[PDB]
Amino acid sequence: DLEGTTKRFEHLLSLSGLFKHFIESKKFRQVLDVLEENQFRESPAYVNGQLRPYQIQGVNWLVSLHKNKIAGILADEMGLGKTLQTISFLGYLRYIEKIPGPFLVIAPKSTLNNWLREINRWTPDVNAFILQGDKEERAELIQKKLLGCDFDVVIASYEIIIREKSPLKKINWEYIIIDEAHRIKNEESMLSQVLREFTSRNRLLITGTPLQNNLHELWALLNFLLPDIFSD
DNA sequence: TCAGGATGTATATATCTGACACGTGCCTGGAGACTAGGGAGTAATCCCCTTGGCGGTTAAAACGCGGGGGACAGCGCGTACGTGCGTTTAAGCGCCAAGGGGATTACTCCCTAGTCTCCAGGCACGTGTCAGATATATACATCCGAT
Ligand SMILES: Nc1ncnc2c1ncn2[C@@H]1O[C@H](COP(=O)(O)OP(=O)(O)O)[C@@H](O)[C@H]1O
Ligand SMILES: [Mg+2]
């Protein structure tokens, strides 16, 4: 809790810590009152295939954010290969960090199967167990796989996560990802409301249009990744 | 009948969200004079209602009979509902956008009500009447039960 909570603070102050408004105003005041006195440049191929030069630093940015243990949103534009740049990071955890699964692949219904198609083409031998279908084929799939604790990559749609919450609510998670995250722009939206209760270390959000309506929507995205940091 | 199905029916678990308990203040109910007018009690007058009995007229009501036709029981029968299975289709559920509608919440005034003060003139009551609605009779024309 506080070991990461404190460490993130001066790390924000470390890399251009020019905030000086909410880093100190934020009940974390007494927590920081204690301290108030004071890399894959080779297009690596652990995941199969070659990575074009401008795609790597994004992964290292994810790696650096992971190595610093803070969540981050990427804002690659449409058609730029966010799919590859997403699964590559998970390969980093599986290969370099040796932490395979569990993770979610919360995505639109249209792209449910699409990522799995792209998942295998750069990283075969993966545990992708998409949860989709009628009331039945989903149901028995819960016990054998979701309740079997034998997965690393879980694919489920916006509508699914609001249905199969009770299984996934029990399961602890490391990371949770949402593609085309802008549907989380109303912080009282029931899907956004449900995701508050999902236990995870950090979260990843993929978007191309973070700011669409106001600047108030950005904080709702920020309230999701780092609720402690912004919280208002 | 009995075994084959299909259908409620108890039962344990996990979820949750709705009922309940708790602190604040502000607003309303309570204490306490002060007063006036509604209502309780009284007296007087007159019309209606009671209880028990009597006498009379005269239509309705009670009773019996006979005969028809309407009811209720059966017998087909041929639909028109049921039951079941497959498959679309729409209800419901989320989400996006911007407004207007509305309900407090808080001052201001205008004006339009209530209150009083006379004072005439509407209206209710007690008097005639005569015109409309009776009851009478009769001729008729108009349905109903047998050829
Ligand atoms: N380094 C690469 N080499 C070859 N193809 C790539 C590379 N990076 C991305 N792609 C392809 O470009 C496509 C871009 O898709 P993307 O925009 O990530 O989809 P989405 O918008 O649904 O996330 C992907 O389907 C992927 O196959
Ligand atoms: Mg995409």
Coordinates of C-alpha atoms (C1' of nucleotides) and ligand atoms in Angstrom, one line a residue:
Chain A
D1 CA 0.0 0.0 0.0
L2 CA 2.0 2.9 1.3
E3 CA 5.3 1.6 0.1
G4 CA 4.1 2.0 -3.5
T5 CA 2.0 5.0 -2.5
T6 CA 4.9 6.9 -1.1
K7 CA 7.4 5.8 -3.8
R8 CA 5.1 7.1 -6.6
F9 CA 5.1 10.5 -5.0
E10 CA 8.7 11.5 -5.3
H11 CA 8.9 9.6 -8.6
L12 CA 6.3 12.1 -9.8
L13 CA 8.5 14.8 -8.3
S14 CA 11.5 13.1 -9.9
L15 CA 10.6 13.3 -13.6
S16 CA 9.5 16.9 -14.1
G17 CA 7.8 17.2 -10.8
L18 CA 6.4 20.6 -11.7
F19 CA 2.9 19.8 -10.4
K20 CA 3.1 21.6 -7.0
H21 CA -0.7 21.7 -6.6
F22 CA -2.2 18.3 -5.8
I23 CA 0.9 16.4 -5.0
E24 CA 0.7 18.1 -1.6
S25 CA -3.0 19.1 -1.4
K26 CA -4.2 15.6 -2.4
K27 CA -5.7 11.8 3.8
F28 CA -2.2 11.2 2.4
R29 CA -0.8 14.4 3.9
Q30 CA 0.5 12.8 7.0
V31 CA 1.8 9.9 4.9
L32 CA 4.1 12.3 2.9
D33 CA 4.7 14.4 6.1
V34 CA 7.3 11.7 7.0
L35 CA 9.4 12.5 3.9
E36 CA 8.8 16.3 3.9
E37 CA 12.2 16.8 5.4
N38 CA 13.9 15.9 2.1
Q39 CA 16.9 -1.2 -22.2
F40 CA 15.4 -3.1 -25.2
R41 CA 16.8 -0.6 -27.8
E42 CA 17.3 -3.6 -30.1
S43 CA 13.6 -4.2 -31.2
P44 CA 13.8 -7.4 -29.0
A45 CA 12.2 -10.6 -30.2
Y46 CA 11.3 -12.5 -27.0
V47 CA 7.8 -12.1 -28.5
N48 CA 8.2 -13.3 -32.1
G49 CA 8.8 -10.8 -34.9
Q50 CA 10.6 -7.6 -35.4
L51 CA 9.3 -4.3 -33.9
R52 CA 9.6 -1.2 -36.0
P53 CA 11.7 1.4 -34.3
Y54 CA 9.1 3.9 -33.0
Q55 CA 7.1 1.1 -31.5
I56 CA 9.7 -0.1 -29.0
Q57 CA 10.0 3.0 -26.8
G58 CA 6.3 2.8 -26.2
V59 CA 6.8 -0.7 -24.8
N60 CA 9.8 0.5 -22.8
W61 CA 7.6 3.3 -21.6
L62 CA 5.1 0.7 -20.5
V63 CA 8.1 -1.3 -19.1
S64 CA 9.5 1.8 -17.4
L65 CA 6.0 2.6 -16.0
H66 CA 5.9 -1.0 -14.8
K67 CA 9.5 -0.9 -13.5
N68 CA 8.4 2.3 -11.7
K69 CA 5.0 0.6 -10.9
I70 CA 2.6 3.3 -12.1
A71 CA -0.3 2.9 -14.5
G72 CA -0.3 4.7 -17.9
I73 CA -2.5 5.3 -20.9
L74 CA -1.1 5.0 -24.4
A75 CA -2.6 7.3 -27.1
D76 CA -1.5 5.7 -30.3
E77 CA -3.5 6.7 -33.3
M78 CA -5.9 4.4 -35.1
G79 CA -4.2 1.8 -37.3
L80 CA -0.8 2.3 -35.7
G81 CA -0.5 -1.3 -34.3
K82 CA -1.7 -0.8 -30.7
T83 CA -2.6 -4.5 -30.7
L84 CA 1.0 -5.5 -31.1
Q85 CA 2.3 -2.8 -28.7
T86 CA -0.2 -4.2 -26.1
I87 CA 0.6 -7.9 -26.2
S88 CA 4.3 -7.2 -26.4
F89 CA 4.1 -5.7 -22.9
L90 CA 2.5 -8.9 -21.6
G91 CA 5.2 -10.9 -23.2
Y92 CA 7.7 -8.8 -21.3
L93 CA 6.0 -9.9 -18.0
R94 CA 5.9 -13.6 -19.2
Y95 CA 9.5 -13.7 -20.5
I96 CA 11.6 -11.1 -18.8
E97 CA 9.7 -10.9 -15.5
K98 CA 8.3 -14.5 -15.7
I99 CA 4.8 -13.5 -14.5
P100 CA 2.3 -15.1 -16.9
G101 CA -1.3 -14.2 -16.1
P102 CA -3.9 -13.5 -15.1
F103 CA -5.1 -10.5 -17.1
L104 CA -8.2 -9.2 -18.8
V105 CA -8.7 -8.2 -22.4
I106 CA -11.9 -6.1 -21.9
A107 CA -12.7 -4.9 -25.4
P108 CA -15.6 -4.1 -27.7
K109 CA -17.7 -7.0 -28.9
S110 CA -16.5 -6.5 -32.5
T111 CA -12.9 -6.9 -31.6
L112 CA -13.3 -9.8 -29.2
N113 CA -11.8 -12.4 -31.5
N114 CA -9.6 -10.0 -33.4
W115 CA -7.0 -9.6 -30.6
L116 CA -6.7 -13.3 -30.2
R117 CA -5.9 -13.5 -33.9
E118 CA -3.2 -10.9 -33.4
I119 CA -2.1 -12.4 -30.1
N120 CA -0.9 -15.7 -31.6
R121 CA 0.9 -14.1 -34.6
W122 CA 3.5 -12.5 -32.4
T123 CA 3.4 -14.7 -29.2
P124 CA 2.2 -18.3 -29.6
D125 CA 2.0 -20.7 -26.7
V126 CA -0.4 -18.4 -24.8
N127 CA -3.4 -18.9 -22.5
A128 CA -6.2 -17.1 -24.2
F129 CA -9.6 -18.3 -23.0
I130 CA -12.2 -15.9 -24.4
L131 CA -15.4 -15.8 -22.4
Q132 CA -18.2 -15.3 -24.9
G133 CA -21.4 -16.9 -26.1
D134 CA -24.9 -17.8 -24.9
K135 CA -25.9 -18.2 -21.2
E136 CA -24.7 -21.9 -21.3
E137 CA -21.3 -22.2 -23.1
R138 CA -20.1 -19.3 -21.0
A139 CA -21.4 -20.9 -17.8
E140 CA -19.5 -24.2 -17.9
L141 CA -16.5 -22.3 -19.2
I142 CA -16.4 -20.5 -15.9
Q143 CA -15.7 -23.6 -13.7
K144 CA -13.2 -25.4 -16.0
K145 CA -11.2 -22.3 -17.0
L146 CA -12.2 -19.1 -15.0
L147 CA -12.6 -21.0 -11.8
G148 CA -9.9 -23.4 -12.9
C149 CA -7.2 -20.8 -12.2
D150 CA -5.4 -22.0 -15.4
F151 CA -5.3 -18.9 -17.6
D152 CA -3.0 -16.0 -18.4
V153 CA -5.1 -14.0 -20.9
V154 CA -8.8 -13.5 -20.5
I155 CA -10.9 -11.9 -23.3
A156 CA -14.3 -10.6 -22.4
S157 CA -16.5 -7.8 -23.8
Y158 CA -17.9 -4.7 -22.2
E159 CA -21.3 -6.5 -21.8
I160 CA -19.6 -9.6 -20.4
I161 CA -17.8 -8.0 -17.5
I162 CA -21.0 -6.5 -16.4
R163 CA -22.6 -10.0 -16.4
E164 CA -19.8 -12.3 -15.2
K165 CA -18.7 -10.0 -12.4
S166 CA -19.2 -12.5 -9.5
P167 CA -16.6 -14.9 -10.9
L168 CA -14.1 -12.2 -11.9
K169 CA -14.8 -10.2 -8.7
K170 CA -13.4 -13.1 -6.7
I171 CA -10.3 -13.5 -8.8
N172 CA -7.4 -11.3 -8.0
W173 CA -5.6 -9.7 -10.9
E174 CA -2.3 -8.0 -11.8
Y175 CA -3.3 -5.9 -14.7
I176 CA -6.6 -5.0 -16.4
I177 CA -6.8 -3.5 -19.9
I178 CA -9.6 -1.8 -21.8
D179 CA -9.4 -1.0 -25.5
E180 CA -11.1 2.1 -26.8
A181 CA -11.4 3.3 -23.2
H182 CA -13.4 6.4 -24.0
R183 CA -16.6 4.6 -23.0
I184 CA -15.2 5.3 -19.5
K185 CA -15.9 9.0 -19.7
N186 CA -18.9 9.1 -17.4
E187 CA -17.5 8.2 -14.1
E188 CA -21.0 7.1 -12.9
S189 CA -21.5 4.8 -15.9
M190 CA -22.4 1.4 -14.5
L191 CA -19.4 -0.3 -16.3
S192 CA -17.0 2.3 -14.8
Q193 CA -18.8 1.8 -11.5
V194 CA -18.2 -2.0 -11.6
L195 CA -14.5 -1.7 -12.5
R196 CA -13.9 0.2 -9.2
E197 CA -14.2 -3.1 -7.4
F198 CA -11.8 -5.1 -9.5
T199 CA -8.6 -5.9 -7.5
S200 CA -5.5 -5.2 -9.6
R201 CA -1.9 -3.9 -9.3
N202 CA -2.1 -1.4 -12.1
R203 CA -4.4 -0.8 -15.1
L204 CA -3.7 -0.1 -18.8
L205 CA -6.1 2.0 -21.0
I206 CA -5.8 2.2 -24.8
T207 CA -7.3 5.2 -26.6
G208 CA -6.7 7.6 -29.5
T209 CA -9.2 10.3 -28.4
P210 CA -8.8 10.9 -24.6
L211 CA -10.3 14.4 -24.8
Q212 CA -13.6 14.4 -26.7
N213 CA -16.2 16.4 -24.7
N214 CA -14.6 18.3 -21.8
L215 CA -11.5 18.2 -19.7
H216 CA -13.6 16.8 -16.9
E217 CA -13.7 13.5 -18.7
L218 CA -9.9 13.2 -18.5
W219 CA -10.0 13.2 -14.7
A220 CA -12.5 10.3 -14.9
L221 CA -9.8 8.4 -16.9
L222 CA -7.3 9.6 -14.3
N223 CA -9.6 8.6 -11.4
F224 CA -9.4 5.1 -12.8
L225 CA -5.7 4.5 -13.3
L226 CA -4.6 6.4 -10.1
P227 CA -7.6 7.1 -7.9
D228 CA -5.4 8.0 -5.0
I229 CA -3.4 10.6 -6.9
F230 CA -6.3 12.6 -8.3
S231 CA -9.3 11.6 -6.3
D232 CA -11.1 14.8 -7.1
Chain B
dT1 C1' -51.8 -49.8 -11.8
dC2 C1' -46.9 -48.6 -12.4
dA3 C1' -43.0 -46.9 -13.9
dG4 C1' -41.5 -42.5 -17.0
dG5 C1' -41.4 -37.8 -17.0
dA6 C1' -42.2 -33.3 -15.6
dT7 C1' -42.8 -30.1 -12.1
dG8 C1' -42.8 -27.6 -7.9
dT9 C1' -40.4 -27.9 -3.6
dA10 C1' -37.1 -27.5 0.3
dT11 C1' -31.8 -26.1 1.2
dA12 C1' -27.1 -24.1 1.5
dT13 C1' -24.2 -20.0 -0.3
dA14 C1' -22.9 -15.7 -1.8
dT15 C1' -24.5 -10.9 -3.0
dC16 C1' -26.4 -6.8 -2.1
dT17 C1' -29.0 -3.2 -1.3
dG18 C1' -32.5 -1.6 1.4
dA19 C1' -33.9 -0.9 6.5
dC20 C1' -32.4 1.0 10.4
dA21 C1' -29.6 3.8 13.8
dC22 C1' -27.4 8.2 14.7
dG23 C1' -26.2 13.6 15.0
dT24 C1' -28.2 19.0 13.7
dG25 C1' -31.0 22.6 13.5
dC26 C1' -35.0 24.8 12.6
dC27 C1' -39.3 25.0 12.8
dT28 C1' -43.4 24.1 15.0
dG29 C1' -46.2 22.8 19.2
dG30 C1' -46.6 24.2 24.0
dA31 C1' -47.1 27.5 28.0
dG32 C1' -49.4 31.8 29.3
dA33 C1' -52.5 35.8 29.3
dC34 C1' -56.7 38.3 27.0
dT35 C1' -60.8 38.5 25.0
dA36 C1' -65.2 38.0 22.6
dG37 C1' -68.8 35.4 20.5
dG38 C1' -70.6 30.8 19.8
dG39 C1' -73.3 27.6 22.1
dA40 C1' -75.9 25.7 26.2
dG41 C1' -80.1 26.5 29.1
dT42 C1' -84.6 28.8 29.5
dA43 C1' -89.2 30.4 28.2
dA44 C1' -93.2 30.7 24.8
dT45 C1' -96.0 28.8 20.5
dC46 C1' -97.6 25.9 17.2
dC47 C1' -97.7 21.8 14.1
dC48 C1' -96.6 16.9 13.6
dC49 C1' -96.2 12.3 15.4
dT50 C1' -97.3 8.6 18.7
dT51 C1' -100.6 4.4 20.8
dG52 C1' -104.6 2.1 21.3
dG53 C1' -109.0 1.5 19.4
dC54 C1' -113.3 1.8 15.7
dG55 C1' -116.0 1.6 11.0
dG56 C1' -116.3 0.9 5.7
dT57 C1' -115.1 0.3 0.5
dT58 C1' -113.3 -2.3 -2.6
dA59 C1' -109.5 -3.7 -5.4
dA60 C1' -105.6 -6.8 -4.9
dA61 C1' -104.0 -11.0 -3.2
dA62 C1' -104.5 -16.0 -2.3
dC63 C1' -105.9 -20.3 -4.3
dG64 C1' -106.8 -23.9 -7.5
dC65 C1' -106.6 -25.9 -12.3
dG66 C1' -105.5 -27.0 -16.9
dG67 C1' -102.4 -27.2 -20.4
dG68 C1' -98.5 -25.6 -23.1
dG69 C1' -93.9 -24.6 -23.9
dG70 C1' -89.7 -23.8 -21.9
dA71 C1' -86.1 -26.1 -19.1
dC72 C1' -82.8 -29.6 -18.9
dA73 C1' -80.9 -34.4 -20.3
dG74 C1' -78.8 -37.0 -24.0
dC75 C1' -76.6 -37.7 -28.8
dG76 C1' -73.5 -36.6 -32.5
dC77 C1' -70.1 -33.7 -34.7
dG78 C1' -67.3 -30.9 -36.5
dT79 C1' -65.0 -27.2 -35.4
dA80 C1' -62.0 -24.2 -32.7
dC81 C1' -59.4 -24.1 -29.1
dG82 C1' -55.3 -26.3 -26.8
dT83 C1' -50.3 -28.0 -26.5
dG84 C1' -45.8 -28.3 -28.3
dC85 C1' -41.7 -27.0 -31.2
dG86 C1' -39.0 -23.9 -33.9
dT87 C1' -37.7 -19.3 -35.0
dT88 C1' -37.5 -14.5 -35.5
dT89 C1' -38.2 -10.0 -33.1
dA90 C1' -38.7 -6.8 -29.9
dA91 C1' -38.2 -5.5 -24.9
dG92 C1' -34.8 -4.1 -22.0
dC93 C1' -30.4 -2.2 -21.0
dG94 C1' -26.7 0.5 -21.3
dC95 C1' -24.7 5.2 -23.5
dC96 C1' -24.5 10.1 -25.9
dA97 C1' -25.6 15.2 -26.5
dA98 C1' -28.0 19.7 -25.6
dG99 C1' -31.7 22.3 -24.1
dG100 C1' -36.0 23.4 -21.4
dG101 C1' -39.5 22.4 -17.3
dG102 C1' -40.1 22.8 -12.6
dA103 C1' -39.6 23.2 -7.7
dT104 C1' -37.7 25.7 -3.9
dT105 C1' -35.7 29.8 -2.1
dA106 C1' -35.8 34.9 -1.2
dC107 C1' -37.4 39.6 -1.6
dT108 C1' -40.7 43.3 -3.4
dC109 C1' -45.0 45.6 -4.2
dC110 C1' -49.5 46.2 -6.3
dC111 C1' -53.9 45.4 -6.0
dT112 C1' -57.5 43.0 -4.8
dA113 C1' -59.8 40.5 -1.2
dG114 C1' -62.0 41.3 3.6
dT115 C1' -64.2 44.6 7.2
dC116 C1' -67.2 48.2 8.7
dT117 C1' -71.4 51.4 7.8
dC118 C1' -75.5 52.8 6.0
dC119 C1' -79.3 52.2 3.1
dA120 C1' -82.7 51.3 -0.2
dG121 C1' -85.0 47.4 -3.0
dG122 C1' -84.7 42.1 -4.0
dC123 C1' -87.2 38.5 -2.4
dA124 C1' -90.0 35.4 0.6
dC125 C1' -94.7 35.0 2.5
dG126 C1' -99.5 35.3 2.6
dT127 C1' -103.5 36.5 0.0
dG128 C1' -106.8 35.3 -4.3
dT129 C1' -108.4 32.9 -8.9
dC130 C1' -108.7 30.2 -13.3
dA131 C1' -106.7 27.3 -16.6
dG132 C1' -104.7 22.6 -16.9
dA133 C1' -105.2 18.1 -15.7
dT134 C1' -107.8 15.1 -14.5
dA135 C1' -111.2 11.5 -14.2
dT136 C1' -115.7 10.1 -16.7
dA137 C1' -118.2 8.0 -20.8
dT138 C1' -118.2 6.2 -26.3
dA139 C1' -116.6 4.8 -31.2
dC140 C1' -112.9 3.0 -33.3
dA141 C1' -109.2 1.0 -35.1
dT142 C1' -106.1 -2.1 -34.1
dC143 C1' -103.2 -7.0 -32.7
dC144 C1' -104.2 -11.9 -31.3
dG145 C1' -105.8 -16.9 -31.2
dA146 C1' -108.3 -20.3 -34.6
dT147 C1' -109.4 -21.7 -40.3
Ligands
LIG1 N1 5.6 -4.1 -36.2 C1 4.6 -4.5 -37.0 N2 4.8 -5.3 -38.1 C2 3.8 -5.7 -38.9 N3 2.5 -5.4 -38.7 C3 2.2 -4.7 -37.6 C4 3.2 -4.2 -36.7 N4 2.6 -3.4 -35.8 C5 1.2 -3.5 -36.1 N5 1.0 -4.2 -37.2 C6 -0.3 -4.4 -37.7 O1 -1.1 -3.2 -37.8 C7 -2.4 -3.4 -37.5 C8 -2.9 -2.2 -36.6 O2 -4.0 -2.5 -35.9 P1 -4.4 -1.7 -34.6 O3 -4.6 -0.2 -35.0 O4 -3.5 -2.0 -33.4 O5 -5.9 -2.2 -34.2 P2 -6.9 -1.6 -33.1 O6 -7.1 -0.2 -33.6 O7 -8.1 -2.4 -33.1 O8 -6.1 -1.7 -31.9 C9 -2.5 -4.7 -36.6 O9 -3.6 -5.5 -37.1 C10 -1.2 -5.4 -36.8 O10 -1.4 -6.6 -37.5
MG2 MG -8.5 -1.3 -31.4

